[PDB]
Amino acid sequence: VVYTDCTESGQNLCLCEGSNVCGQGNKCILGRGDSKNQCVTGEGTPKPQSH
Numbered sequence: 001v002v003y004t005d006c007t008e009s010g011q012n013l014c015l016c017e018g019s020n021v022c023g024q025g026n027k028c029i030l031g032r033g034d035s036k037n038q039c040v041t042g043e044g045t046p047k048p049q050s051h
Contacts, residue, residue, distance in 0.1 A: 004049040006030060006037065012044030 003021060006014040009029040015021055016028035016039045027044030030037055 002050060004047070006047055008047065010045055011047035012039075014047040014049070 004014055006012075006016045006022070006028040007030075009031070011028055012022040012024065012026050014028065016037055020039060022028050022039045022044065025041065025043070026039050027042045028037065028039050
């Protein structure tokens with residue numbers, strides 16, 4: 001299986017923080033500056049990565 005990094009904000013099932021594979025109950029948000037990648041708590045979305 002091939003996991004990837006989060007591309008959009010609101011996705012979870014991807015490597016958000018360094019190697020952290022965010023899943024359910026979490027949501028990654030890619031902002032700006034130093035706050036460009038974070039696993040915030042809530043509900044994200046499955047990030048498409050494989051066709």
